Amino acid sequence: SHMALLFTPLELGGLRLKNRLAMSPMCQYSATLEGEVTDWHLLHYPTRALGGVGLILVEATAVEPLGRISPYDLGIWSEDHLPGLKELARRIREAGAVPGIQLAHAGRKAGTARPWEGGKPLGWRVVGPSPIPFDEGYPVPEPLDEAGMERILQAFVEGARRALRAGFQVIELHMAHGYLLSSFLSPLSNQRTDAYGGSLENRMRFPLQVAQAVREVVPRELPLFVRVSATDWGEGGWSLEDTLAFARRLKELGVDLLDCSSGGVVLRVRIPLAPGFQVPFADAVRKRVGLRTGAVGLITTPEQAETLLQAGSADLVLLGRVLLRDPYFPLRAAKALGVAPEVPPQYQRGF
Amino acid sequence: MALLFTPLELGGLRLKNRLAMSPMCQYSATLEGEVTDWHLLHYPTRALGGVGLILVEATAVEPLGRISPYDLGIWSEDHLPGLKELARRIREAGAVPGIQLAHAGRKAGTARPWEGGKPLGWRVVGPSPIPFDEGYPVPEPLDEAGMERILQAFVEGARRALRAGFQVIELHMAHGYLLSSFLSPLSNQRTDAYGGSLENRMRFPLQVAQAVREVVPRELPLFVRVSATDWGEGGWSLEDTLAFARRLKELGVDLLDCSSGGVVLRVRIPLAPGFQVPFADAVRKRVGLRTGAVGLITTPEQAETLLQAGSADLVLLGRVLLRDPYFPLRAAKALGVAPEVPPQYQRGF
Amino acid sequence: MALLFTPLELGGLRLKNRLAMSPMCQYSATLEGEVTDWHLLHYPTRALGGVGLILVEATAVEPLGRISPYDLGIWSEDHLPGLKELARRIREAGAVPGIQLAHAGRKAGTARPWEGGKPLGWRVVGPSPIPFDEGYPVPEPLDEAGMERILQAFVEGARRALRAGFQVIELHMAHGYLLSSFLSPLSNQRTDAYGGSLENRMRFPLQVAQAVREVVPRELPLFVRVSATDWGEGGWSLEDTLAFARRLKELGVDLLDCSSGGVVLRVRIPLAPGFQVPFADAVRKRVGLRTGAVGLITTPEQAETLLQAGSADLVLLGRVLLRDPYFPLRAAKALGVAPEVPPQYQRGF
Amino acid sequence: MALLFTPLELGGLRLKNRLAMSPMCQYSATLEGEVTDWHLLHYPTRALGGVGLILVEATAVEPLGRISPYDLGIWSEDHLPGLKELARRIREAGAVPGIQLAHAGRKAGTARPWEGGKPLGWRVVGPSPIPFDEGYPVPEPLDEAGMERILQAFVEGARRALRAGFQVIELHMAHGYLLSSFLSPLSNQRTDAYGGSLENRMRFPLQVAQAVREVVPRELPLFVRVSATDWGEGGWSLEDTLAFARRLKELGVDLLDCSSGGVVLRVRIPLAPGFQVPFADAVRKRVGLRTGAVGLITTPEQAETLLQAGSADLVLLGRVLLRDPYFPLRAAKALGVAPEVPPQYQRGF
Numbered sequence A: 001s002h003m004a005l006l007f008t009p010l011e012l013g014g015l016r017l018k019n020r021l022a023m024s025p026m027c028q029y030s031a032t033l034e035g036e037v038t039d040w041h042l043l044h045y046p047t048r049a050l051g052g053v054g055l056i057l058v059e060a061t062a063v064e065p066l067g068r069i070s071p072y073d074l075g076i077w078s079e080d081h082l083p084g085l086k087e088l089a090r091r092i093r094e095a096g097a098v099p100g101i102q103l104a105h106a107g108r109k110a111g112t113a114r115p116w117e118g119g120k121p122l123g124w125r126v127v128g129p130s131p132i133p134f135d136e137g138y139p140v141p142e143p144l145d146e147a148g149m150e151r152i153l154q155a156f157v158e159g160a161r162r163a164l165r166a167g168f169q170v171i172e173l174h175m176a177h178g179y180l181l182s183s184f185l186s187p188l189s190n191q192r193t194d195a196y197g198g199s200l201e202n203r204m205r206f207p208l209q210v211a212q213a214v215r216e217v218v219p220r221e222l223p224l225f226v227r228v229s230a231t232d233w234g235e236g237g238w239s240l241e242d243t244l245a246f247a248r249r250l251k252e253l254g255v256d257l258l259d260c261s262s263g264g265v266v267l268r269v270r271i272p273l274a275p276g277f278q279v280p281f282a283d284a285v286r287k288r289v290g291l292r293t294g295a296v297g298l299i300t301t302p303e304q305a306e307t308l309l310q311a312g313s314a315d316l317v318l319l320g321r322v323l324l325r326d327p328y329f330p331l332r333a334a335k336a337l338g339v340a341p342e343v344p345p346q347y348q349r350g351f
Numbered sequence B, C, D: 001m002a003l004l005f006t007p008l009e010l011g012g013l014r015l016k017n018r019l020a021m022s023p024m025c026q027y028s029a030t031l032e033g034e035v036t037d038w039h040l041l042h043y044p045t046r047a048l049g050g051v052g053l054i055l056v057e058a059t060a061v062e063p064l065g066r067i068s069p070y071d072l073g074i075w076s077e078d079h080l081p082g083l084k085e086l087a088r089r090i091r092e093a094g095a096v097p098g099i100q101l102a103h104a105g106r107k108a109g110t111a112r113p114w115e116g117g118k119p120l121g122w123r124v125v126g127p128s129p130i131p132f133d134e135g136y137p138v139p140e141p142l143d144e145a146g147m148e149r150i151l152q153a154f155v156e157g158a159r160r161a162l163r164a165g166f167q168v169i170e171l172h173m174a175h176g177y178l179l180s181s182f183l184s185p186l187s188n189q190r191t192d193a194y195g196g197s198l199e200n201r202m203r204f205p206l207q208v209a210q211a212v213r214e215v216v217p218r219e220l221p222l223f224v225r226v227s228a229t230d231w232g233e234g235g236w237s238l239e240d241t242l243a244f245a246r247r248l249k250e251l252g253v254d255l256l257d258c259s260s261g262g263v264v265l266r267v268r269i270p271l272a273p274g275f276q277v278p279f280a281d282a283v284r285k286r287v288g289l290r291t292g293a294v295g296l297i298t299t300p301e302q303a304e305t306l307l308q309a310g311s312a313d314l315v316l317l318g319r320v321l322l323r324d325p326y327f328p329l330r331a332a333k334a335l336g337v338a339p340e341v342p343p344q345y346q347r348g349f
């Protein structure tokens, strides 16, 4: 118990996080029909900020109303989102955690019901690289034109500055899980004939353009995250080695960190699920490309998070479903590693 | 799907899972080094605990290579009966039986931890004439003939373990003992052809590794435990280990078990869960030699995670099996795996 | 401060703590009921696990009083060697050795649980000729001359158990076996002086309890395991047990171990952590007899709470010690108490 | 600080002190020469007495090389079990176990000293055909095939002695026995290359030393017992010893044990405390070979003085350890040195 990296400060860009634990973005589908933050978020996120994560990335917030996953996703497309979003960042920061947010566009997977309300397509005019339905039941995606694509690119750009204006000091771009920019990367969803399809370089283009545009509007001090599905898991698709080329180019545009996810591009696919099953993607990127990486995927234990950080597999450990069932897990993880957690004075007698 | 409980192919054998018990001295052997009743309950219990492999404690290849007077020994062929019966009823529980061959070098001749743990003043040997610490006998610098005599003890000691049924041989080259002492320059400042350079410090250890490898058939994996770092500056570094592994890998060693420390006491170690995993990860990925992870591996999720990340091929468990012998069995059901329980205990799972 | 690991004084002995191993059949004895190598690893393992007391599985006092052909036996004097070594092997590990004397009655002569567990058609005995359930042999009602043989078989078993070093003897009168079947009216509709009234149905069991207390010296506590309820209508009630216990406390029984069920299968049981604790609780406070808690007691905090709450004096552990033999050792340190661990494992704690 | 109780480094060994037990026949072996229960208490007791080294009695390499029918033997491998158990019970008590390999030559085949001691008429061997004395069988001169027969019997006897764990082997070339008889001209009037000249008289003996040296590793010291003088006129004198010693020094022999007499009986010996020390002193200083002092050394102060004067490196005790087995332990306290005593005896010192 002479040491603990999980609760050693992590320096990204120009701020220092109290530890190496972050909350993975997780949609609560509790926003308004116009996408405003509601009372639910103002208890959900601030609770987990008191839970001790150094960083909270609140759920995927769509930069276009029809780029939303569900009708009740958070939004950042209108300047009337700032009041609700501004207070969200304020009540997260007050609780102790740095507030960061994920900018997203659901692409051909846009317009789904709530997971507990069915999760059935609603019939929106979804967009995407090529006109291939995500699966049976989904609207036939509309191949996006550069005019369109510039609108999305500028939706991510204005969406980011809107997030910064709200106080969010970390921005993650959703380029995973078969959503818009992930759809452009994996060949299971993009068989485009233009300069944004065919070759690997062409298919990484639009995505890499969005990354460039956002980098320009985010100051150096604030780290720019990018979440990517490191593999689609279906053959003739996005491979691990393809990601290292993609990761190389993002590190080279100035992106500060990677969040290594997987899957989502298609359904007829098998994923090797296990504790830390996506860690090999974070490890490969960090060591073979030199870009900071974030590990996620059934990370549920203090010792497991600490071990992959010790092993140099990642710089930041993101927690998802563990923080839904256990919001104050990070506080107890610190005490489970011989580290005194900086707990609120009202709770100091509870530790 | 858990990698922790998928068979692992090493040499010419298959282990029921990727969990092994790290070698751990019980200081309960006889004064002649024979297996006692203690081992015949200690080791078989942890094998029933579900480990794919049981690595028996450091067993001295020479009476003067023992840590304590009650260490296990393999220097006489009258050790075979007790050792064979131990390895036999290790198989009884399900786990592959393995043994660690060791020579305590300048750290030889200490009492038991609960009897003081203090040197007894043997004529210990070593690379250079430096006591391990205050109180320890000054080791006698070994001559070429002296170390070659050691090597034949490791070779015949290996030959003896095979005769007894041990299917895995690990050479203890870590923790400041004889062959570890030759590797680290903090205890080997020799002026001859066996000191100074890394190659000179690696010669005798690799000479023993090659000599033993020749008597161990390809099918049976030859392990090597090494202190991946002295932790003292200007000492054995991770990158020195990275050369040692490349050179061990070329000799036929099938897997490296990466530990650290032990060469000296005046030093700080960044102690934490899986703090030595970075050494296994570095060796496994940068040299291509199979590696075993050890060091505060206490949870099912972390063991599987370092395996998933490709940091190691085999997970070694130490102090966890002292307090929790049946941990591997309960770890499996905690990972969705049908434990491999005995029929008499299935009503308990 | 944990009382769970405070010494318990029973009769004339002191136990290192208030944790005991519940009797658990391994069905690994010989066809004559001799202790095998399994028992000599099973129990000695859990004794090192830190339980203050080990109650070995039900050992039949009559060959046809066995549950399985491979149950332990205490009917022949050739059991002493194996039984004596078991107690010797348990005491060395730290735990006091105790044994459960049993007669399976109408449930006697079943296969192994992992071999089908279906009857083998023995000439089982019992109070009344009622099958445990369909498929089972209907027991032959015993005569007074017949019953005296069993009474002397239990006295014989206790006298023999003492010779072997077992310092605590528990009489199995629960779970629908011979004496439990005599207690619950769902299996005892006898017309003579050993059926009908509660007193008549309690008669033969108390005769055995009395007869054994006589052969067992004062210093050694005599336990009795009872099915505190049968979960069956028109059967052994909670309050019937308090009358039965009030009588056993008069007879010299030093402690009651309260389980439940077993008399019949077609019944409801409220499964839950410590669901049988209320039966242990009721006996201790309303009668004044020491009681032992059993029934899904699996955590350190839970054991200490029921002892703190005064529901029992001893906590018996079953399936937890099959999956975690060393659980008591980790439970003490998980309660801020330094556990007395073997020196070989102190660096694992 | 007394030098008598300073560690002695001879070979690759370190002895707890400079006290050793001189070889002393008990004539208590079996008729086949196996170790008996007597030896398994005799020597281990004196090892507990604190001597750094135990040199076991004269052990015959040939049935007709025995002094008495009840001498120890090393000619058949069925002596090994008994010899191995002796060597370990000596080692367990604290002292290094050593053995004297011997051939009684023309003095072979005598009764026990307390049974008459009269010859039995064996076909004893020797250099020349001269009886040891009236009544003894006339020895048959050995041929080179005959002498090689013994030389290789001495060699395997050493290889056999090492195999049993004895870490010091002494070749008995004194007291008028086979190899001593070749040395003294009063018993060797041979006409060939093994009599007459000193070299010749030294030829066959040096051949055995060389042959044994080759099979004994450097780490184990090879001792040699010599009658430093026969005491008979015109016979083996001290200066014959210094010539003999210098050449053994070069074979690699690690130490000489200087005795005297035995070649013939009709001669007077200057009996006195340390009367044979002058031979040990002369050899150590004039030849440079380590030496062992023996001969009526009975006090702690006297032993320390001859060691201080550089008269010897090792002090051997004979009749003193028969009447006073624990003499060395009390000699340490008689010199202000804390003797490492068994813990059971610490309150007696």
Ligand SMILES: Cc1cc2nc3c(=O)[nH]c(=O)nc-3n(C[C@H](O)[C@H](O)[C@H](O)COP(=O)(O)O)c2cc1C
Pocket (backbone or CB within 6 Å): A024, A025, A026, A027, A059, A060, A102, A174, A176, A177, A227, A261, A296, A297, A298, A299, A300, A318, A319, A320, A321, A322
């Ligand atoms: C309700 C739920 C909502 C989620 N929403 C998102 C999301 O909006 N963006 C994203 O990148 N991952 C999302 N995830 C995935 C998690 O962030 C995380 O990658 C996944 O759960 C693996 O890590 P974990 O097992 O620790 O949760 C969601 C997961 C769940 C259960």
Ligand SMILES: Cc1cc2nc3c(=O)[nH]c(=O)nc-3n(C[C@H](O)[C@H](O)[C@H](O)COP(=O)(O)O)c2cc1C
Pocket (backbone or CB within 6 Å): B022, B023, B024, B025, B026, B057, B058, B100, B172, B174, B175, B225, B259, B294, B295, B296, B297, B316, B317, B318, B319, B320, C344, C347, C348
């Ligand atoms: C009592 C104890 C005895 C040990 N004996 C040995 C040994 O004989 N040889 C060796 O290479 N490591 C030995 N170790 C070290 C372990 O094998 C392991 O490398 C170290 O304890 C870290 O593993 P762990 O933290 O998972 O237990 C011992 C450790 C302990 C606590």
Ligand SMILES: Cc1cc2nc3c(=O)[nH]c(=O)nc-3n(C[C@H](O)[C@H](O)[C@H](O)COP(=O)(O)O)c2cc1C
Pocket (backbone or CB within 6 Å): B344, B347, B348, C022, C023, C024, C025, C057, C058, C100, C172, C174, C175, C225, C259, C294, C295, C296, C297, C316, C317, C318, C319, C320
């Ligand atoms: C394999 C197994 C064997 C058992 N054998 C016996 C027995 O022989 N005699 C007895 O009185 N209870 C026996 N029991 C019941 C236990 O002693 C105990 O009453 C039950 O397990 C509830 O406690 P637990 O949940 O801690 O295991 C056995 C239970 C199991 C799972």
Ligand SMILES: Cc1cc2nc3c(=O)[nH]c(=O)nc-3n(C[C@H](O)[C@H](O)[C@H](O)COP(=O)(O)O)c2cc1C
Pocket (backbone or CB within 6 Å): D022, D023, D024, D025, D026, D057, D058, D100, D172, D174, D175, D225, D259, D294, D295, D296, D297, D316, D317, D318, D319, D320
């Ligand atoms: C019974 C007795 C047996 C002996 N046996 C041997 C022997 O086997 N080999 C030998 O070299 N000296 C033998 N010796 C001589 C002693 O080892 C020693 O040299 C001699 O006694 C002088 O030493 P001391 O007077 O202190 O005893 C024996 C002496 C005695 C009294």
Ligand SMILES: [Cl-]
Pocket (backbone or CB within 6 Å): A146, A149, A150, A153, A209
């Ligand atoms: Cl564009």
Ligand code: NA
Pocket (backbone or CB within 6 Å): A142, A143, A144, A145, A148
């Ligand atoms: Na469009």
